[model samples]
Target: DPMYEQFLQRIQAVRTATVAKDISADILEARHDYFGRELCRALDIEYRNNVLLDEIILDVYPGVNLMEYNVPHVTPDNYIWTGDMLLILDYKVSVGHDSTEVTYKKYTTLILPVMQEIGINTEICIIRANPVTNQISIVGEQFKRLFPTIPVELNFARFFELRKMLLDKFADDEEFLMMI
Candidate 1:
């Protein structure tokens, strides 16, 4: 669990620590992406990340709205094909941006069905972590709609408890101000 713990710690730093007063969100988001990918890399898991959806499609959808179907350069996140199943892991550092019904559907409705059509058993797991509020979650809204039961593979809520444990250990006295 060291790497897992370390990933959570780094994610906390990325979310809570500030370099400059008005640092652009673009750089922060890039950092989040880096840390997210590195977690899998550190574990030595063969994961395909930032996959380009444009090249894979032949006639899946022509000029479709977007997603793993017809989106050009639409990258999701970490993806792993573990012999039997394809696991799609998306890391949302902050809450508001991609934690909506629309975005979640894009991860599920837009991509899952297309992946299913590709004859690959796919399970999408989205981790929404808001360091400011010390809140972490597993998003599988559309999965519930498409899937008969929320697969145990996709229930990552347990990780959130471990995440909270890290914060609990660190939240001594005026904790985040230590970074400030």
Candidate 2:
């Protein structure tokens, strides 16, 4: 599951590529792959594509003493399973972004409960990047307020911050330099 060679190749590709100043909304709408590909390539994590939840299901109670089966079947943009921990990364690109609200709902209802039930600790983080508006937000406070006692950690990563981290850490790396 190591991708040292692929990482180098992606970085090389970015160096020679001519990046568009403003991509179309349709392009940005498919920004999940952009974040997942670039971040995982830089961070040395494998990008698991469209992972399914065929074996997991949850019961939702819509009425008194009545329950129905439901499954979120969320294939997070990228996730890394390290035997002891499952780190999920989901990217949100929107001018009117509500990453805090969106991620909170996913965490509270589906992701958190499923992880807890399965006995694998989880760390879920949302990466917000609105290239058109250049906006970002993190929900550390809201997370604490909502689930103060849980060991599960939910966090956020602004796109620019991640870009800066890669550039700063890999100053002379052509792949990182071209990423900006």
Candidate 3:
């Protein structure tokens, strides 16, 4: 009974410390809003594609600390899991034309091996958005070229609908309204 009580206190202390020094109301809300958008996108995709019931799980690892192979702690944007498949969805945004060569290199050299080590008969999806043009580019051209045998899907211009769907779905929620 005493050990259990001590454990509870330690957990409470962790929470107290986290709330006191690590996170604030605004930061927490921002995190919530961003994740909410991602959730909406994922849900909209599942709904539009009619694959909601399929065993798909969204795995979000924010601020993950990894020390394997002298690797830095990498926080991935998004990862999706389905039966017999793993989807690495990276959402990137740019205001103007930019080279994503570095990103591709990191993905192939760092993230790719980590993903494989962790495990995945995987699919990589890059959701790139350009706000100035309201254009969306799902990039997988290079990945497809490199891994010809693997399945890849690219959607350029039109995924903005996912954001709209999120807004519409959360219009009635007070927390979502606070974001606006």
Top candidate on lDDT is 1
- Candidate 2's displacement at residue 8, Å, is 28
TM-score per candidate, chains pooled: 0.47, 0.46, 0.40
lDDT tens digits by residue: candidate 2, 32-125: 4554555455456666545544322211112322132344667666555554455555656555557556765776567776566545566666
- Which window of 10 residues has the lowest lDDT sum in candidate 3? 47-56
Clashes of 1: 0
Higher-ranked by lDDT: 1 or 2? 1
Cα RMSD for predicted model 1:
10.0
lDDT of every model, 2 decimals: 0.51, 0.47, 0.42
Error of 3 at 14 (Å): 33
Candidate 2 global TM-score = 0.46
lDDT per residue for candidate 3 within 1-180, as digits (tens), equals 353343334334533323222223333333333433543454443312212211222233323333343433444355455555666555555544353445555555655665555444565555545544635555565433433442222232222333343445444656445545
Candidate order by TM-score, decreasing, is 1, 2, 3
Candidate achieving higher lDDT, 2 or 3: 2
Write the residue-wise lDDT of candidate 1 on 1-180 in tens digits. Answer: 463555455545544334221122333454455446544554455555466554333223345444434443456666554556665667666646546445567777766766655565767767554544535456654432434332211223435554454455445535453543
Q: Give the lDDT ranking, best first.
A: 1, 2, 3
Error at 178, model 1, angstroms: 31
